[PDB]
Amino acid sequence: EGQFNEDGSFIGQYTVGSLVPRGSNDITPLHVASKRGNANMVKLLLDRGAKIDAKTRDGLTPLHCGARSGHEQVVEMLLDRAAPILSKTKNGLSPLHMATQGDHLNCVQLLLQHNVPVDDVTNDYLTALHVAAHCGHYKVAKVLLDKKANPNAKALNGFTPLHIACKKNRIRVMELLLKHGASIQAVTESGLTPIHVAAFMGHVNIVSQLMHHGASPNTTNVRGETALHMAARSGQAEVVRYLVQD
């Protein structure tokens, strides 16, 4: 009865890789076609019935791969053939998080136009706006905020996109969030404000900018520390010099 199956040793050997065996054929031809952005290959494979929601070991669907690399035509083609828009990877990343991570304005808009909830969260409770603040993607953050992403949304450890822009020294995103209503006095799980976070990592320009917008330097965390205590505990001499000289 095996005579009525596909046989041979070449099926699946030329999808990815170059003579080095891979443990499982989790990466399908549709994943490869979407990562490359070849809409002709995608239409070919979808017409032959390729599984549109197949997942890799990490849980990436073809829609995740197309959005991660910003291949707008592939993404629309997958969405028009009903690829699940909210499919998540093992750590909770939707295709919108991956489009945001690659600073792909076209694919972020395209997913938002297909009714992806703008504040869909990962397992760390990161929205796409959190990810844009982490990467410093000003353009995409502005798109998410225009579609009403919550600028005070909290991750698991209580960080808002503003806390993250301050931890990662993203001055443009920090300024954009403040213009769009991110609370400068928002507090994390351990009582830290955005100026505590910038002062600890030594981001002097962010500390001064937060000071211009009314950040209180005398606020204290759960452990009783002000921003100057944390700048002194970490040794950021220029943050220390700025706080005392002001």
Residue numbers in the entry: 251 to 496
Per the authors:
The axon initial segment (AIS) has characteristically dense clustering of voltage-gated sodium channels (Nav), cell adhesion molecule Neurofascin 186 (Nfasc), and neuronal scaffold protein Ankyrin-G (AnkG) in neurons, which facilitates generation of an action potential and maintenance of axonal polarity. Among these proteins, Ankyrin-G (AnkG) is considered as the master organizer that directs the recruitment of diverse components to the AIS. In addition, AnkG is also well known to interact with Neurofascin 186 (Nfasc), a cell adhesion molecule that is essential for AIS integrity. Here, we report the high-resolution crystal structure of the AnkG ankyrin repeat (ANK repeat) domain in complex with its binding site in the Nfasc cytoplasmic tail that shows, in conjunction with binding affinity assays with serial truncation variants, the molecular basis of AnkG–Nfasc binding.
In agreement with our understanding of ankyrin structure, the Nfasc ABD peptide extended into the inner groove formed by the ANK repeats. However, in contrast with the antiparallel orientation (N-terminal to C-terminal binding) observed in other ANK repeats–target complex structures reported for ankyrin family proteins (Nav1.2-AnkB, AnkR-AnkB, etc.), the AnkG–Nfasc complex adopted an unexpected parallel binding orientation (i.e., N-terminal to N-terminal binding between Nfasc and ANK repeats). Although we used the Nfasc 1187 to 1214 segment for crystallization, only the Nfasc 1198 to 1214 region could be clearly traced in the electron density map. Unexpectedly, we found that instead of the more easily formed antiparallel intramolecular interaction, the fused Nfasc ABD bound to another AnkG molecule from the neighboring asymmetric unit, forming an intermolecular interaction. Thus, we believed that the parallel binding orientation was not induced by the short covalent linkage but represented the native binding mode. We next examined the specific interactions between residues responsible for their binding and found that the AnkG–Nfasc interface is mainly mediated by hydrophobic and hydrogen bonding interactions. In particular, F1202 from Nfasc inserts into a hydrophobic pocket formed by I277, V282, and C315 from AnkG. Similarly, F1208, another aromatic residue from Nfasc, occupies the hydrophobic groove formed by AnkG residues L343, L376, and V381. Among these, we found that the E1204 sidechain from Nfasc forms hydrogen bonds with T339 and N341 in AnkG, while the main chain of E1204 forms another hydrogen bond with the sidechain of D308 from AnkG. In our solved crystal structure, the corresponding Ser and Tyr residues of Nfasc form 2 hydrogen bonds with H384 from AnkG.
